[PDB]
Amino acid sequence: TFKELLEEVEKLAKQLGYEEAVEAVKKVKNSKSTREEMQIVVEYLRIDPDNIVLRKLDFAVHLKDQGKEEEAKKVLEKLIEELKKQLE
C-alpha cells in the first residue's frame, strides 16, 4: 500500500540519517487527506529543498492528488530502490 511504502521509505531514510525527511514522511503517512499531505510536503520543502526524499515524496503526493495512486506508488518504489542502493 501507499502507507506501507511510506513506512519503508521512512525506515531507509532513518537508516541513512535523514531526520527532516523522516519527520515529513511520518506526517504524510499519518495525514487524513491529500490536502494535509501536501501541506506537510510544502513545510518541509521550505526547510530542505534539495532533499531527494522530499522531492520524490512531493511528486508522489501530487500523483495521489490526481487519483493516480499506482503511479504514486511506483514513484516510492523507485525512491526505496535509490535509498537501498545508497545503503548497501
Using the rule CB under 5 A, is 37 a contact of Zn ion?
no
> Residue from 19, 36, 47, 66 that binds its own copies (CB under 8 A)?
66
CA distance 88 to 83: 9
Q: Which position's Cβ is nearest Zn ion?
A: 58
CA 66 to chain centre: 16
CA distance 19 to 42: 16
Using the rule CB under 8 A, is 74 a contact of its own copies?
no
List of residues contacting its own copies (CB under 8 A): 38-39, 41-42, 45-46, 49, 55, 58-59, 62-63, 65-66
